């Protein structure tokens, strides 16, 4: 009698699926909070994700169904797909004499610097979100040129860009 659970993303606001008609479907989140819904006469259920729950991707959700006689199904599992890009990274001021670009980004993201000629350089953010990207000494940055930085998570979601002007 285990219910089905439709695929859940990090941007989802509800969890839906199929269960025995008019059963009580119970969704348990990693933080121990639960949310419930009642399946309709055709067995379709919807459970609203509480606003106090933030799913980022990778979480395991558990869903059970309980009939009017108190029999509860075995749990069904769903893993949350990460479709949410990181926030825009920060970028510390960059002078024309700088040898690296540093800043903060989502931990473990891939940070991509686009130089004003369109070439690129990358660095990996550490577990605290710090990144450092080396500027090759044959790349000449001049005052007034623009730099652009993005951060991309492991599932390929890329942040909005952050710009800074060379000093």
Backbone φ, ψ for residue 55 (5° rounding)? -95, 125
DSSP 72: B
- Closest distance of CB 81 from a copy of itself, Å: 4
- The interface with Ca ion within residues 92-131 (CB under 5 A) comprises none
DSSP state of 87: P
Tell me whether residue 76 or residue 130 sits nearer to a copy of itself (CB atom). Answer: 76
Residue 164 and residue 146 in contact, taking contact as beta carbons nearer than 8 Å: yes
Cα–Cα distance for residue pair 142/162, rounded to 1 Å: 18
Q: Known binder of ligand: residue 54?
A: no
- Partner that binds at residue 153, options a copy of itself, Ca ion, none, CB closer than 5 to 8 Å by kind: Ca ion
Select from 20, 32, 31 the least CA-distant residue to 64: 20
> Is 33 annotated in some ligand binding site?
no
Length of the chain in residues, anyone? 167
Contact string 65-104 vs a copy of itself (x = CB under 8 A): ----------------x-xxx-------------------
160 contributes a contact to a copy of itself by CB under 8 A: yes
Other CB atoms within a 10 A radius of the CB of residue 113 amount to 24
> Applying CB under 8 A, does 54 fall inside the site for a copy of itself?
no
| Site of interaction with a copy of itself (CB under 8 A) | 6-9, 11-17, 44, 46, 81, 83-85, 114-118, 142-146, 148, 155, 157-158, 160-161, 163, 165
């Amino acid at each position: 009698d285990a219910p089905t659970v439709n695929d859940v993303t990090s941007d989802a606001t509800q969890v839906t699926g199929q269960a025995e008609p008019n059963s009580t479907v119970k969704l348990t989140f990693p933080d121990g909070t639960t949310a419930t819904g009642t399946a309709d006469d055709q067995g379709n259920y919807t459970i609203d994700i509480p606003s106090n729950v933030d799913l980022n991707g990778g979480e395991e959700l558990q869903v059970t169904a309980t009939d009017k006689d108190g029999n509860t199904s075995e749990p069904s599992s769903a893993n949350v797909t990460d479709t949410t890009a990181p926030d825009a990274p920060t970028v510390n001021d960059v002078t024309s004499d700088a040898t690296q670009v540093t800043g903060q980004a989502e931990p473990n993201s891939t940070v991509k610097l686009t130089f004003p000629d369109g070439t690129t350089a990358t660095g990996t953010a550490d577990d605290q979100g710090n990144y450092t990207i080396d500027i090759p000494s044959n790349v000449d940055l001049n005052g007034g040129e623009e730099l652009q930085v993005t951060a991309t998570d492991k599932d390929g979601n890329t942040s909005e860009s952050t710009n800074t002007t060379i000093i």
